[PDB]
Structure formats: C-alpha cells, structure tokens
Amino acid sequence: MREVISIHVGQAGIQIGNACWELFCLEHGIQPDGQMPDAFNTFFSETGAGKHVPRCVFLDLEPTVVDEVRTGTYRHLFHPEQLISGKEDAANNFARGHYTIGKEIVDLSLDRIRKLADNCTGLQGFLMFNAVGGGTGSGLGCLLLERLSVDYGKKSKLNFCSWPSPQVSTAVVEPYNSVLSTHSLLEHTDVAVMLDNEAIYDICRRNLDIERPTYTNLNRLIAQVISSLTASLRFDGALNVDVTEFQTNLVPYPRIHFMLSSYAPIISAEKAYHEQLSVAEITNSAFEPASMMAKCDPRHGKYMACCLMYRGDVVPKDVNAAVATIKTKRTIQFVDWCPTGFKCGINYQPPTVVPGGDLAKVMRAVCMISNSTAIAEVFSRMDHKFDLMYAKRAFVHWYVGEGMEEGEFSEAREDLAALEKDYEEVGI
Amino acid sequence: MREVISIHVGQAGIQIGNACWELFCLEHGIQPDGQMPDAFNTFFSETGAGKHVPRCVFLDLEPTVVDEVRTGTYRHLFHPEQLISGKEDAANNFARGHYTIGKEIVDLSLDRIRKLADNCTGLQGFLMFNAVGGGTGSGLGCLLLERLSVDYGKKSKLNFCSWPSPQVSTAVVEPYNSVLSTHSLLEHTDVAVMLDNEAIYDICRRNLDIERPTYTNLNRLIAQVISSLTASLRFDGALNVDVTEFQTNLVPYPRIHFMLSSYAPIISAEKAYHEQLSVAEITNSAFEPASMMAKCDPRHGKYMACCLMYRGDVVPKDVNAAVATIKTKRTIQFVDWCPTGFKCGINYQPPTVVPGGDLAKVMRAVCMISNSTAIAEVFSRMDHKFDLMYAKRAFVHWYVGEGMEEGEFSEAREDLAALEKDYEEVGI
Amino acid sequence: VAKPLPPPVQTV
Amino acid sequence: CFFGPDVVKRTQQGNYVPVRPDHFAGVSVALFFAKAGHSKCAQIVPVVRQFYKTTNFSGEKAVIEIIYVSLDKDEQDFERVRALMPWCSVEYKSCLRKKLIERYRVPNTAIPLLIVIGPNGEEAGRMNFQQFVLQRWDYRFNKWP
Amino acid sequence: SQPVFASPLNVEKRRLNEERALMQAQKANIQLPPNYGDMDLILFPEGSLKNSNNTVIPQSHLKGKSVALYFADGADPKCASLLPFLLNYYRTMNEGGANQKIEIIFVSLDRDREAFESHRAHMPWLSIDLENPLTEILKRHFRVMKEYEVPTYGYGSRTGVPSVIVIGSDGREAQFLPICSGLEEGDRALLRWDWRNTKFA
Amino acid sequence: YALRDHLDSKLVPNQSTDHTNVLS
Amino acid sequence: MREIVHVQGGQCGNQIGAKFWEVISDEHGIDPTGTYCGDSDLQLERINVFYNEATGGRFVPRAILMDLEPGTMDSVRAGPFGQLFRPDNFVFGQTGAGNNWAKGHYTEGAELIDSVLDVVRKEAEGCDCLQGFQITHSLGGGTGSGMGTLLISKVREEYPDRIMETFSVFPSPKVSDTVVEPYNATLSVHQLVENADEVQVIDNEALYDICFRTLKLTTPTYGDLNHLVSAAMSGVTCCLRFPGQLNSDLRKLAVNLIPFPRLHFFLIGFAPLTSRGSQQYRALSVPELTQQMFDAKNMMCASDPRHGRYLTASAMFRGRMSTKEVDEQMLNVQNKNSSYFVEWIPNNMKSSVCDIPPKGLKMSVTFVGNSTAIQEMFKRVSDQFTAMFRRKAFLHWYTGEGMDEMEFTEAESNMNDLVSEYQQYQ
Ligand SMILES: Nc1nc2c(ncn2[C@@H]2O[C@H](COP(=O)(O)OP(=O)(O)OP(=O)(O)O)[C@@H](O)[C@H]2O)c(=O)[nH]1
Ligand SMILES: Nc1nc2c(ncn2[C@@H]2O[C@H](COP(=O)(O)OP(=O)(O)OP(=O)(O)O)[C@@H](O)[C@H]2O)c(=O)[nH]1
Ligand SMILES: Nc1nc2c(ncn2[C@@H]2O[C@H](COP(=O)(O)OP(=O)(O)O)[C@@H](O)[C@H]2O)c(=O)[nH]1
Ligand SMILES: [Mg+2]
Ligand SMILES: [Mg+2]
C-alpha cells in the first residue's frame, strides 16, 4: 500500500494543505466528517468503522491558523494531536525558528512523524509544504528537515517551498529568511520545487480572467499540482511513474534538485468547453513561459529533465506525438548531455474538479515538473537583496539576540553563491 | 478537411456576421448554443463532446455591437476570446485604425487566428467582412491584412467590403477612408466583391416590396450570397467550384479581382408563388442590371469572367441552355479574349430560409459573381469626391495629427488613377 | 465549507 | 423530502401553482437571495434575468433553475417583486425560507447573492456581487441525476 | 421557449406535460427535462372559439387552415382604419378558391363587455370571449400590451393594438404581420400573409 | 443525395418509364 | 469605458446641468435617493459613462460643481435630483464673480483653481479610460465665462487628447441683463478657439423663440430653458450610452463635422418639439422630423442658417426607424435646397441611428450642424465690443484687477480672424 506523509509547516503550509486535503477528500469520496457513502491507502488510513483519518501533520508556531482548523468544517477529520500548535510565533525570523523556542515543538513533531510511520507499510516519501519567506517555515523547517534526515535518511523528501517573489513582498526581511534557509533545502532535501506566488497570480489572471485572486485561489492550483504528483500512487493506468523513479529520472546531480512546475489545463467555464482541449495544445501551454508557476523564464539557460504526468483519457500514442513536437521547436533548447530527457506518466482518473473554485472538467491534464539552469535567476534576484541588506549590517540584531552568532549570514551567502556557479558549470 | 475563417471587422463586420452566422446555425441544424437536437466542419470546430464553436474572430474597437452579441441569444455560441472588443473607436479615420488605436488590439487578434489556423487540417480561405468607408473597418482592415499576408501567404482571402456609395452616404469623411483602404484591396488581397448599401435597398424595393428595410434585412441578403458562395465546400453536389477555383477562373490578370454580385431568387412569397422559378428566368434576373448590388450598369461596362453558383434541383442540362440564351442576348456583351469563360457549379441542398424574415421558400437559386470592367466607374465616382475636398486640404488636419503623414494621400490617389487605366487597358 | 461529493465514476 | 409541501412556488398568471417535487432532475440549481428596495438588487435582478432566459431557452432541455429567496419586510412588496422575477420562488409565510437563510448565513451588504447547490442540498458554489462575473457559474456543473 | 419563456401558456405547458413525462417515467430511460419536440400542448380549451351565431367549436376544427390571432380595440383609430381592409382580405382569400385558406381568431383589448360585442358584431371570424382567462393569457403570452400597466419580464414589447399575427401548430410563432412595428405597413402588410406555408396542424 | 446521376436508362438504354375528338 | 465628466460652471451652468442630471437619471432610471427602478438590462449597461459607483450600490454623477458664490450651490443641493452629488465636488467660493472676466481668470477664482483641478483629477485618473470632458458654462457672466474657461485651459494641458464638449450660452441679441456682455464674450472666445474642440452654441433669446412658436408656452420658465437644452444633451451623447445600428461616439461627431481646426461652432437643435394642441393631430415619421430639425424656427441658436450655408451637418436619430428611411431623406434635403450646402465638400451630412429612443417619444433627432451663418452672432458680439472699447468704457475694473488693454484689442483681433475665416468658407 504505497503512500506518503505530508508535513505542512508554517502558515502557508497550513493553508496549502487546507485546500490540498479538501481535494484529497473530494477525490476519494470522503466526507468532511471522515466517512464513506485501495486508492485511499496513500493519503488516508482506515480507523475501524469506515473512518479515513488523513496522513499529514499541521505544524505552526502561532496558534491562530491551526486552531482555526480545529473549529472548522474538517475539525472532526484530522487527529487532534496531528494538528500541533505552538504558542509563540517566530515572527519572520530564521533565528527564532531555528535556535530559540523551536525544539519544544520539534520533539513533539517527530513523536507524530514516528507514530504516523508506524502504520506505514512501504512509505515512499515526505512532502514538506512551507514558506521560506516567513520565520516558522524557514527556521523551524531547517531544524525539522535536518533531524528527519538523521532519523529517516533514505526516504524521499519532496520539498514544496513558496519562494519569495521578485516584487511581491508582504514583509521586508524575507532576504534574510530564505538565504539562511538555503543551507537546509540544498543538502537535506531530495527534490525541491519552487512555487513563486506572483507567478501563480499571473496564471490566475491571464488564463482565468480572475483579476482579484485571494489565497485560496492560489492554494487550489497548488492542490491540483500535488494531486497529479500522487495520482499515479493511487490510481492505475498506462505507463506510470512513482516517487522513487521521480528523483532518479529528473535529478542529474545530487547537488542540483531545484525544480519548476506548471499545470496547464487551467481555465474556467467561460473558455474551457468552447476551446478544443487535447494533448497537443495542453502540453504546448505547459511549456509556455506564461503558465510557469515560478518566475523562472525558461528561455534563459537549458532544460535538463522534464516529467510530463497526464491524468485522464490519454492514450500512449498521442503523448509521443506531443513530446515529439516539443523537440522540433527551437525555443525549447535542451542540454547537450541529456538527449532523451523526457519521463511520461499517464493515469486514467481525470482531474477531480473542486466545486466553487474556477476549474472545469478538463478530461485531460498535464503536470510538468522540469529541471533547468534558469533556476539560477531565481537565486540571483535573491542575492542582491541580501547584499544590500547586509552591506551595512541592518536587521541582524534580532537574529543575533536569539541565538545565531554572526557568521551564519556569511556562510549561507557563499553557499548560495556556489549554487550559482554550480549551475554555471553544469551548463556550457 | 475543408475549412474557412471569418475575420469580420467594424460594426458592419459584426452585424453582417450576425445574420451570416444565424443562417449557418439553422442551415447545418445546430441550435443556438452548441448541439444538434458531417458538413459542420468547415465553419465550426467540434469540441469532442457536443458544442460546435464557430470559426469567427469578430472584431471591433468598441463594446456596443460586440456586447449585444455577448448578451444576446447567441451568448453561449461564440468563444468569448474570439469576440474581441477594443476600448475606443477609430471614429471614421484611417489614421487611428492604422496607427493610433492600433497594434495593441491587432496583436491580440493575431494569436486568436493563429490558434484557429493551427486547429484546422488544411486551410482554404479567409473571409473578411468590413466597411471601407469608416474607421475600424478600414484601418484595422488594413493592419490585419498586412499582417495576415506576410505570414499566411499561401492561402487565399476574400474581401467582401461595403464599398462607399454615390448618393446615400451616412458619412462625409467617407471618401477619404476608402481611397486610403485601396492598399488593402489592390496588392494585398485576392477576389473581392463590392457590395453596396442602397443597391441592396433597390433590389428589396423592386422585388420584396419592403417599404423601409433596416440593416437587419440588408445583412441577410449578404448572408444569402455568402452562403451560396461557400455552399459547395459544405454540401455535396454535381460539378463544384471552390475557393481556389474562384481565383483560377474569375481573375484574368493579377490585379483585376474587383467583382460584382447578383443573387436572383430575391422574391417574396406572394410574388414568387404566382411564378415559376425555372433556371431560365432566374439567370435572366441574375444578369439583370438592377438585381446586381453595386449600382454600375453592366450595359456600359464589359464582362470578363462570370462564375455562377446555382443551388437546389438544377440539373446540368438546363443550365447549359440557360447560359446559351445569354450568348444570344446582345445587351450582355463580353470581352474578346475570354470567349469561353462561364464556370458554373451546382449544389443539391436547397436554400435554407431564415424564419421571420423576407426570402420565401424557393427550391432553386443562383448567385453570380462577375468581373465587369464597369467596376472601374465604382472607383471613379469616389475619385471625384476625393478630389473635391482634398483640393483645399479639408479634414486632413485630423488625418495627419495622429501619426499618418501627408503624402500617403497622394500615392493612394495615384493608386486609384493607375487602377482606372488598368481597367481601361484590359478591355479595348 | 462542505462540498458536494462528485458522482461515482462507473467502471468502463 | 427536503422542501416538502407547496412552498416551492412556480409562477402562473390567474392562479398560483407549486412546482412539482422532481422537477429538478437534470438541471442546475441556484438560490438567489435578494431584497426589494435594495439598490444593488435593482441591477443584479435584470442581469441574472437576461442570463436566465438566454442560457435556459437556447437548449431544448432546461439547463438552469433559480430559486428566489427574499429578505423583504412586506408581503405585498414580496408579491410585487415575485411578479417581477420570472423564476421559481418560495412562499413568504413558509418557514423553509427562514431555514435556508439561517443555514446559508445570509446577513440581514452581502445581499444580493447566489448559492448554486448540489442534489442533496449543500453548497456547491458561492457568488457575491459586491463591487461580467455572472458567467463564472456553468449550467453543466450541477447535472442532477 | 417559443416565442418567449415569460408567458403563462408556456409555463403551464411545460408544467403539465413535464408532469406527464415523469408520470410516464414513474410508471416505467427518458431524458429529463424533455425536449422542445417532446413538449406538446392543446392550445385552446373546449370553450374558447365562437363563430358568428355564437356556436362554440373545438380546436380540431382549425385543421388545415392558416390561422392568425388578431388583438384589436374598438376605440382604437388604427383598428378602425384596419378593419375594412382586413374584411376585404378575408372576403377575397376565403371566396376565391375551393378551400377556406385563412382563419382569424380575435382577442379584444376593449374596456368592457358592451364594447366587446359592439366590436365583435362587425366581424365574422372566430374569437375568444373576454370573460375567460384565455384572453389575458394570450396577450401576456404574445406580449401585445396597449400601454404598460402589467410589468413584463424584461422583453421589450413588440406590438400593441392592433396586431394580426399568424400562429403555428404547437403554440409557436411563425411570423408577425408588420402593421404597427419597426416596418410600419398598415393596411398593406396584410398581404404579407403566407397562407400555404403557415398551416395549423 | 445522388439526384444528378439518376439512372434514366437501363442496361440496354431503352429510355425509362416516364385533345382529340371523334369524327366517326 | 467612455467616461464623460460634467464640469458644471457658473450660475447658469448649474441649473442647466441640474436638469441634465434630471433627464439622464430619468432615462437610466435612478431615483434621487440613488437606487434604480427600471427593471431592464439595457438601461444598466452604460451607467459608467456618467455615474461612478459607490458603496452600498449608490451611483454618483461624475460632476464637479463649480461657482464663486454659494447661493446657487444651495439651490442645486436643495432641489430635487440634487442630493445625488458628492459634497466635495461642491467646489465653491465665498466672494462671488461679479460679472468681471478678470475676476475669474486673474484673481479670486484662480485661488479656487487648485481645489477644482484636484476634484477633476480624482474622478478622472482612476479608471480604464475616458472619452472626454463635458462642460456647461455661461459666457457673458463672471463664473462660467471667467474661471470656467481657466478650467478649460488647464484640463487642456493635463489631457491634450480628450474631447472638450462645451455647451456654452452666448449673449442674447435682442436684450439681456449684465451690461458687460461684450467684455466677457470676446475675451472668452479668445481661448475657446485654441484650447478647444466642439464649441456648440446656445442662446437665451433663441431658445425663447422655440418656446413661443414651436412649443407655445404662454408662461415659459427658466426650467423649461434648461429642459430643452437637457433634451439635446441626451441626443448628442446617445451612442455612447445605448446601442444602435450605426453607432457614433462623441469623437466620431467631431471628425466628420470639422473641416478646419478653428471651424468648431455647431448649432444644436431638438426634434420633435410639438405643442399640446398639435400633439395628436400631427404624425411622427422621419420626413416630419427632418422638416422640423432643418427648420430655422427650431434651432437653439438665434443665427438664422438661411443667411449662410451648411459646411457639414450631422444628425442623431434615436428610435425604431429604418436606416433607409433616414438616408434618402438626407439625400432629398441635400438635393432640393443645394444653395445652403457647400459645393467643395460633396454630400454634406452624417447620419447616426440609435436603436433606443429617448424616454417617452417613439423617435427623436438631434441636429449638430456646422453652418457658417453663425457670423450673425459673432458680428453682433463684435459691433457692441467696438462701441464699448473705442470709448474706453468700464475698463477701470478690467485693468485694475490685473490686465491691460492689449488683451482686449487682440481678443478683438482674434475675433475678426474668426468671422473672416467663415466668410471665404461660404
Ligand atoms: N501560496 C501561498 N503562500 C502563502 C500563503 N500563506 C502565506 N504565504 C506566504 O507566506 C509569506 C508570509 O510569511 P508566513 O509564511 O505566513 O510566515 P510563517 O512561515 O508562518 O512564520 P511566521 O512569520 O512566524 O508566521 C508570504 O510571503 C506568502 O508568500 C498561502 O496560503 N498560499
Ligand atoms: N452592409 C452594411 N453596411 C453598414 C452597416 N452598418 C454600417 N454600414 C456602413 O458602414 C459605414 C461606416 O462604417 P461603420 O461600420 O459604421 O463603422 P466601422 O467600420 O466600425 O468603423 P468606425 O468608424 O471606427 O466605427 C457606413 O457608411 C455604412 O454605409 C450594416 O449593417 N450593413
Ligand atoms: N437658461 C439659463 N440661463 C441663465 C441662468 N442663469 C443665468 N442665465 C443667463 O446667463 C447669462 C449670464 O449669467 P450670469 O448668472 O450673470 O453669470 P454666471 O453667474 O456665471 O452664470 C445671463 O444673460 C442669463 O440670462 C439659468 O439658470 N438658466
Ligand atoms: Mg515565522
Ligand atoms: Mg467601428
């Protein structure tokens, strides 16, 4: 019974898994009360009289979004101590997330990770959902990922980070939070994916005609991506990919595991059924830079390895024709040492459409997770924000007061610097 | 597969297409939304599960005639990103339709028609409906034609334009726009029919009575002509003439493609049913100088090529006799170097009648397109009324004050002068 | 809020 | 039986009729919360009205249906606006309307509002109008068995 | 749906025969809701149409006749000018030939009963008595309102008094005769009738 | 709809199937 | 889309425009309380042309109110259809323009200018676009003629691409109040030729002449003066608010009605204008609307177009009429009396058809014609200016408040260039 444990950390993580477990319950016919009117044994566990408790853990240092699930419609779905709530937040501080407060909630967190892995009979990986722009997603996630790599070293560590936008901020101190968090997701995760917020604003505007998106509009697109990642782990069909071959077929070198994402049947009922949707154009829209869920314009650099996971009524013949037309156009320029870099999954279950949100019954789907050397521009807009902040030693007095002696700012800067030249020599 | 794209522009383009597409809806047997309660695949594209979205890219720069289609009974018929409405009007000015309120709406018109041309297997023609005496129908008619010719150069294009009329005007800056639209009618288009507005007032006067017809009745007689023209592509038949066969048989020399039109079963039910409709009298009315919709009497012109598209139960035996008495008529004189040119086509499907309209149920039809050299005078009455105002530079301060340069007037003037001598030398 | 469950996908 | 008695009114001129129980098969259902004398309702009603006619009576099968629930203060005012709304409505004296409002959390500026519903009776799509947005909901969403 | 939804005739039609459809389904796979070709109605009741001498006739007597309703008012000057020409047209059409081609069904917008017979006695074709609800049901159905006193459901009124208007078989609309419309041919669009195309059946 | 190619002639052609007073 | 903002100015401007917001609000169906009762979509599809939205569903007019004297501000607020206006759109002084043109343009009206451009900016910048600015004012007074055209000049600087539809009341020929009629008139038409667009003409003795003969008002009112102008407001801006067969926005009016840039003076007129006695006896058809609208007894200007020649003309039909029935009527009126149309522009007339009639009437037409005959008015403004200026009359106010007699004599010199320019174009 192949399965994963999803660890949601930070306020972004609580709300991402809020819509993500809405989609998973609606996918497997599970009520908010936890009942039913082998696919369910990937995200839910049977608890006697027709009860399917989820296999996640909600984690946050502030008790204002997790208890805000404890009094909601899914209040009687999650296990009561599966929702772990801290007492003081980190308040946009990597030092407060990693050094002070911190460990008091961590030893209770792996008390639930170990207990959830007891019921696991062939655990396939961990799915962290966190923001590296905040404090309890960055600092707490750093110590969490480092300690899980001590306990479960060989297990997959799929890491879904909402990386800070080039322009959209909602703070000013996110140059300090994410760069200090870089030393965590660069040598303690297995496949990290960047999910930039303003890019997901643009896919909700250019495609959906929604010029006023809120956070739950973004979170349903995130849930639609993750559902397609784990669709092959619950529903059967054509040529499949699991998570174990997901690392090996997309990660060329162990130092490089940052990844992109784009889901592109993405359209509301205004245009969905009038437009003819087929594998030729939904793949062409997935590779389109306007549909990309990070500000990682792939005209820059080379591609390295792309995974195309389609869910719905796709036969294996016209997926090969769709991939062939990707090779022919010149704008998609590949790297010279990976000729046959294309891994295709085809499922049978169509995308489970959430009511209320702006999604239609697209019978086909695409789910791109593609590696590229254009990820260096995501971290090169990052380093001049860190350099201008740290040029005259500002905003660090909060960090050095609560643990975090001076020098972790400098080694994290040269760690992410060496990441850029790492991507430089991997190209040409 | 055979198909065709409709590229309406201007309020004349929207309104003529409104009558032209309700006719195509009732002819193929599709209800106003998308369904039948294999000939549809030339004006509609199958959604795979029902809906027949059309192949129209209706264009205007203001939301006053596009939005009434958007809120009318055909609301769930057209793809909403094919109905492209701008923000501010060209206001009967070629310079604003070509330069000022320009490229920001023609670049969005191009990727919609790129997707139409991609989602069609073997393309045949581009039907443009516009009024050349106005604003967006002339300026965006010219921008969207210069761009269409340079990328889609191998395929043909049919400009059914509302040429300005001698007496009835409904505009006073009307002589400028059409002289300056001659570039989009001379060296950047294939076959083109000069359909007028009070020439069609008279044909419904003499034959349908109708004491006061509006634009709705006018757009339906144009809809009849366009229907029977592309009818051979849609239905079966005896010996057929298609869009590529129009240019090979009507166009003698590369610049001569200015054409007349004369449908002639335009009879109401009371007049028609006291009358037989056999093919002899319907082709005398087809060649009858008042039934043609341009006002230029062909008795003082000279025919060079005539394609006649018959419809209904027209056997080929009596059409050879019907054109035989056209030889014996001295009033229909032909040019000496095209002795044999009559190219006829017969469809089987009798003409569908619009309910609540003004055509009667007639079992036979004929639509004649002619290359009479009398069409030169259609350009010469406009040459006189262009010279009258330009002689003291009237109205040109709002033709040069927004991006157009003076001296484009003079070379467009020379294009009409070279056109008049072109039609003079092709006869004699 | 609670949402309508989708109709069951009959086997094909 | 959900709604139960006659309380679901179908419009009819000359006499007053309840719509039959299983009318709602194969149609998509939206509750329209409104209140007369409201400035916003005065423009939301005609737009959803034109949408109602255009969407519903192009296809030969009825595709949408709108149930009118009102926050009126006067039964004559309710009658003169029910005579203005062309879709299904509910009785003023019936307590089913109070049950629907108290369930669906309609305050006594969120008015007017749409809640498209599923076959069992729960919320399937929420649509306010506080400010082209009406086209968002699709009739082929709530295909009922 | 024809001509408009917002009409008592259409709503009672769909109610009655759609109740019939699910009565058949409960007795016995049929498509819900039924199709426009599936919905069928008897349009006029048994006590609806009376000729001169006031003998009520059933609906089936209108078989094979091009039938048109005529909404008219006794005091209306358009109707005063229209009536002799329409009498002459009815004259000529029904007398020239072996068949009675046209047939006219009269609905009054008069003030009261006495005005109704004072207008009715001049006229030989069939009519509906004003007292039954059928008169107001028909004028609300076809949207023939003299002056706006009853609130409409968003449709702009096509024509008030007078209106001769040809009727199809199942309560549908074939075409409107343009006597007071956007086309405006009083007394000479009466000859725009299509007496062998539009047939009641 | 093959209504131009009507078979008006059999295998052998034999064209297909379809006032005066008395002065005795 | 197509935002038009009223910039109401002067005493006369605020009751002309208060009736503008009384007839536009009637046609779009808005109660004075700010709600809607018309139950129709086509009414509520171009509300944004004149009504910005506000919280709780209440519309407000995009209407900057402007005076130097708060008495007529009180009258607009107190009257019906008057408490719909935003209270900081009420930009008013406390001193009062005493019919002195210097008093608006170079002193106290000029310190209220920075407040009135602020409220113009706030209701114009935040939008998607705006087609132009609408301005009613009172040439011959102090406020509408005075700082009123100073707001015209500064809006011309801020948005030098948008159209300036100006409904101006020129002085009366026969008799009027306000002895300094000539001093305000010429100095204001100095700048209404270059920071300007369509400057259409309205006169008080002229409009009087309609409501004595064409309408037979035994006791006309100034409210009836504003109502006939307010009917012409809806006609000139009709395709921007309601769909038609041949749509024509307000800029489309200008492009086919102005041959040369300073030639922008337009007679306005309304039809049908029928008296109650003749209400039921006459008919309502396009030949009767055309005969009434070219009739010089109907024109809202006191210039008689038969003493001139139509350069180019235009019409705003509104109703369920035939687009054919319009366009041979235009041809027939051009062919019978060709002596009153220019020969050097052929076919001197634009026609527009709006599907939606005005409120009430089945059909109506509004005439906007650039006749050259308006030099009857302009020479009347000139020959009274020559009498007062040659003998230095009343100038100790106009120079003592901050000008010189250079500005007067070159306003006269600009003015005589205008009558000359129309003359050879005739
Ligand atoms: N996509 C997405 N991003 C979110 C969401 N909620 C928060 N974020 C991101 O989170 C950032 C704000 O910091 P948080 O993540 O809330 O801070 P934290 O990790 O909870 O740590 P604290 O500061 O102690 O609360 C913003 O920049 C957002 O990008 C969400 O629901 N969806
Ligand atoms: N055949 C036909 N011609 C029309 C129709 N409507 C307008 N026209 C002609 O179009 C000419 C002016 O162009 P319009 O279509 O009105 O305006 P446009 O093409 O959209 O360009 P703009 O000026 O920018 O609005 C008029 O002189 C009419 O002769 C119509 O419905 N049918
Ligand atoms: N139609 C109309 N004309 C007016 C009104 N008020 C003033 N006028 C005319 O405008 C001219 C000058 O106006 P005045 O009030 O003195 O200047 P203002 O205060 O700036 O408007 C006078 O000749 C008046 O006849 C009004 O309310 N309506
Ligand atoms: Mg934090
Ligand atoms: Mg246009």
Q: Which residues contact A95 (CB under 8 A, 6 or more apart)?
A: A139, A398, A399, A400, A401, A402, A403, A404
DSSP, collapsed to helix, strand or coil, labels residue E61 as helix
Residue C5: which of A29, A73, A356 has the nearest Cβ?
A: A29
CA separation for the pair E1, E83 (Å, rounded): 31
Number of A to C CB contacts under 8 A, please give it: 20
In one letter, which amino acid is A170? T
> Contact E130/E40 with Cβ under 8 angstroms?
no
Instruction: Tell me, using a 6 A CB cutoff, whether residue A177 lines ligand 1.
Output: no
Which H or E element spans position G133?
A: strand G132-137
Distance from CA of C11 to the nearest CA of A (A): 11
DSSP string, D1-14: -TT-STTEEEP-SS
Instruction: Report d(CA B143, CA B128) in Å as an integer.
Output: 13
B210, E174: Cβ pair inside 8 Å?
no
Helices (H), G106-261: 113-122, 148-158, 181-191, 204-209, 222-236, 250-255
Token pair listed for E60: 């089936």
Cα angle B419, B425, B426 (rounded to 5 degrees) comes to 90
Expressed in angstroms and rounded, the spacing between residue B64 Cα and the centre of ligand 2 is 13
What is the residue whose two structure tokens read 């050259």?
G372
Across the strands, what pairs with E108? Answer: E72
- Say whether B8 sits in a helix, a strand or coil: coil
3-class secondary structure per residue, D23-65: HHCCCEEEEEEECCCCCCHHHHHHHHHHHHHHHHCCCCCCCEE
Peptide bond into D112 cis (omega under 30): yes
Q: Chain F residue with minimal CA distance to B314? A: F4
Q: Is G362 on the interface with E (CB under 8 A)?
A: no
Measured distance CA(G261)–CA(G244) in Å, rounded: 29
Experimental method: cryo-EM
DSSP letter, residue B237 = B
Q: Show the tokens assigned to E63.
A: 């078989």
First to last CA, chain A: 43
In angstroms, the CA E39 to CA E18 distance is 7
Q: What is the DSSP annotation of G375-415?
A: HHHHHHHHHHHHHHHHTTTTHHHHTTTS--HHHHHHHHHHH
Q: How many CB atoms lie within 10 A of CB A249?
A: 15
Residue A273: how many CB atoms within 10 A of its CB?
Answer: 23
Instruction: Point out the catalytic residue in the list A81, A245, A406, A411.
Output: A245
- What is the H or E stretch that residue A321 is in? helix A316-328
Q: What is the dihedral of CA G309, G314, G317, G322, to 10 degrees?
A: 90
- 3-state SS assignment for residue B19: helix
Structure tokens at A114: 């170990």
Is A146 a residue of the active site?
no
CA distances from A94 to A58, A166, A168, E170 (A): 19, 20, 20, 76
Minimum-distance CB partner of A268 among D124, D136, D140 = D136
C-alpha distance from A29 to closest chain C C-alpha (Å)? 6
Which residues have a Cβ under 8 Å from the Cβ of A131 and sit 6 or more positions away?
A: A10, A11, A12, A13, A137, A138, A161, A162
Centroid of ligand 2 to alpha carbon of A321 (angstroms): 46
Chain G (210-239) residues lying within 8 Å, Cβ to Cβ, of chain D: none
Annotate F1-24 with DSSP letters as a single string.
---SS---S-SS------------
CA dist A105 and A141 (Å) reads: 12
Non-local (6+) Cβ contacts of B195 within 8 A are B160, B161, B162, B163, B222, B225, B261, B293, B294
Vertex G12 angle, CA G7 and G17, to 5°: 45
The rounded distance, in Å, linking the Cα atoms of G132 and G6 is: 10
Q: What is the dihedral of CA G173, G175, G176, G180, to 10 degrees?
A: 70
Q: Give the number of beta-carbon pairs within 8 Å between B and F.
A: 10
Both structure tokens of D36: 């007369």
**Strands annotated E in G50-121:** 51-53, 59-61, 65-67, 90-92
Distance of alpha carbon A46 from alpha carbon A275, whole angstroms: 41
Q: What are phi and psi of A290, to 5 degrees?
A: -75, -20
Instruction: Provide the β-strand partners of residue B128.
Output: B159
Whether residue B347 contacts residue B232, with contact meaning beta carbons closer than 8 Å, is answered with yes
DSSP code of residue D20: P
Residue written as tokens 């039986």? D1
CA angle A159, A197, A246 (to 5 degrees): 30
Q: Which of A273, A356, A360 lies closest to D125 in CB terms? A: A356
* CA-based nearest residue in chain D for residue B77: D58
Chain B residues contacting G via beta carbons under 8 Å? 11, 15, 62-65, 67-68, 71, 87-89, 91-93, 135, 167-175, 198, 201, 212-215, 384-385, 388-389, 391-392, 394-395, 397-398
Q: How far apart are CA G32 and CA B7, in angstroms?
A: 46
Cα(G337)–Cα(G340) distance, integer angstroms: 6
- Alpha-carbon dihedral angle through residues A244, A248, A254, A257, given to the nearest 10 degrees: -80
Q: How many CA atoms lie within 13 A of E25 on its CB side?
A: 15
Q: Tell me if residue A5 falls in helix, strand or coil.
A: strand
In whole angstroms, give the CA distance from residue B12 to residue D30: 38
Crossing angle for the helix pair A316-328 and A279-286, to the nearest 10 degrees: 40
What's the token pair of residue A356?
A: 């209320």
From residue D85, give the alpha-carbon distance in Å to each of D13, D78, G157: 13, 10, 50
d(C-alpha A135, C-alpha A173), whole Å: 10
Are residues A205 and A211 in contact, defined by beta-carbon separation less than 8 angstroms? yes
